[PDB]
Amino acid sequence: KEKRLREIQFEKEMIERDMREYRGFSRAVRAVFEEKERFPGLVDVVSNLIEVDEKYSLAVSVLLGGTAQNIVVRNVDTAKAIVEFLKQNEAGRVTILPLDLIDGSFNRISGLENERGFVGYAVDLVKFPSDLEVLGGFLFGNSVVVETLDDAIRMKKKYRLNTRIATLDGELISGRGAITGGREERSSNVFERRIKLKHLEQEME
Amino acid sequence: KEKRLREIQFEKEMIERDMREYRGFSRAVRAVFEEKERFPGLVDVVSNLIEVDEKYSLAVSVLLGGTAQNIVVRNVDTAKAIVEFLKQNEAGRVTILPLDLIDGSFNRISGLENERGFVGYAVDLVKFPSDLEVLGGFLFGNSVVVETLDDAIRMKKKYRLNTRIATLDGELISGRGAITGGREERSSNVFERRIKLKHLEQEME
């Protein structure tokens, strides 16, 4: 019974480490964070600022793609600073999302909810700390979830706009028409490591 | 001269097996091509359908990024076929560009050429086999090249549209504002292979 905690503890935090050390991310994202002092305008990587329910955990994840490890910053200067820092030490590339530059606009369409296989707006599966509301409109708000890739293709042809669409199976159709899909073993569920803690944390309660 | 016009044919052949075997691409991209029969609608990966002077070769390379190994197909069905094929054998994910679904629209703006640090339209550095004209507007046409990242940031704030912008140093600002940059063991040239296979030709004649 005590070994039961010895076994919990050794991960309910042995994992907090990989987190507070960004193990899944690129050499580059890492280099940038161990020098986090040089960048006061730095905030955090996307996957640490989004609140999604343990449920559609895997949902959102797909709509994001590698955007999970985009670095959010307060302003463009911090961005320039990082781009310069990396460019010097040839530490690799990264994608920065400056809060004072990204577009957060997004539109709702009437009757969409009454379309074949609809399933709700992506924005409805996430929460943001207000001072990050744009980051929300930028990452979602223009995305929609449907049932099947066929529903997706149909929809994308009818409205033929620039709306992102994710199927329940995990496919994605970019605003311009690119179809991303397929499966693997690594699961690649960006929010996993965190969910494995929304558990391990209160699990050992 | 005999050992030469013979050495050359020899390299010529091993470069080709790398091509048909798609050596270097993603396991997934590979799996899809060794089963290329199942997908008659299949065309080729982006990096094999662009025609570019080798001066600009590297330029266009950083302009694409991961889009280099997006798989171009004739129609949505072929896409669905592939997505299903991959989803079964858990061979990984890929991004498919169906010719009958991607948006190729793009706009020119007046006076842009008279903006600080302008350097020309990205479309002007590539050629496409007409039956692929959309693929062109989809990949470029909405992209512009400038001198420095500052020129880029300024421009992106003035017109505040959804135009892609690449600097001469290699940075990129997505239509919505994301900044990608950094150096990383130079080159990684998407066309180096096609370019040499063409070079070995001129060495024979």
Side-chain angles (χ1 to χ4, degrees), chain B residues 40-56:
Chain B
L42 197 50
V43 189
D44 215 325
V45 289
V46 165
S47 76
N48 292 338
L49 299 67
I50 294 156
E51 183 59 3
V52 50
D53 223 309
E54 78 151 344
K55 329 180 197 175
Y56 308 64

Side-chain angles (χ1 to χ4, degrees), chain A residues 18-190:
Chain A
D18 298 72
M19 268 206 79
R20 237 48 300 192
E21 160 175 343
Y22 309 78
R23 173 183 289 193
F25 308 62
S26 72
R27 290 275 198 190
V29 179
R30 281 208 303 298
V32 175
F33 278 99
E34 59 165 48
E35 298 272 39
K36 70 174 199 166
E37 54 280 4
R38 313 190 182 200
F39 321 109
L42 192 54
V43 187
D44 211 320
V45 288
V46 164
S47 77
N48 293 342
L49 299 65
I50 288 181
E51 198 89 358
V52 56
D53 207 296
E54 203 273 298
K55 306 172 189 175
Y56 332 73
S57 207
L58 205 161
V60 169
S61 165
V62 306
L63 301 62
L64 299 168
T67 321
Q69 46 174 176
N70 267 193
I71 287 78
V72 172
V73 295
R74 299 288 176 187
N75 61 68
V76 181
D77 304 69
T78 311
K80 286 190 275 201
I82 296 173
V83 180
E84 202 60 18
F85 167 56
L86 291 166
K87 214 154 63 177
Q88 288 299 168
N89 309 71
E90 292 204 354
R93 317 201 67 180
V94 307
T95 292
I96 301 172
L97 296 179
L99 291 174
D100 70 298
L101 182 61
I102 49 96
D103 175 70
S105 74
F106 59 96
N107 34 45
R108 231 93 163 182
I109 309 73
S110 181
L112 240 206
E113 50 285 354
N114 303 312
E115 205 73 4
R116 284 292 171 183
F118 188 73
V119 181
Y121 287 69
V123 60
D124 292 335
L125 292 63
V126 177
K127 283 295 179 299
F128 288 103
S130 71
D131 76 300
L132 289 188
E133 195 175 306
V134 280
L135 188 54
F138 168 88
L139 295 172
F140 317 94
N142 217 186
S143 323
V144 168
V145 173
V146 298
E147 285 180 357
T148 79
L149 164 52
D150 307 70
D151 296 341
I153 301 157
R154 186 193 311 103
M155 181 157 118
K156 178 95 288 188
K157 273 184 175 176
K158 181 186 186 76
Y159 298 78
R160 202 53 171 299
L161 299 185
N162 64 164
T163 68
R164 311 249 288 171
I165 303 176
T167 69
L168 289 157
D169 274 70
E171 294 75 86
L172 268 63
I173 297 73
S174 69
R176 269 170 173 283
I179 301 174
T180 301
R183 188 121 51 178
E184 49 179 64
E185 308 79 298
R186 157 168 281 192
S187 99
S188 288
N189 186 336
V190 184

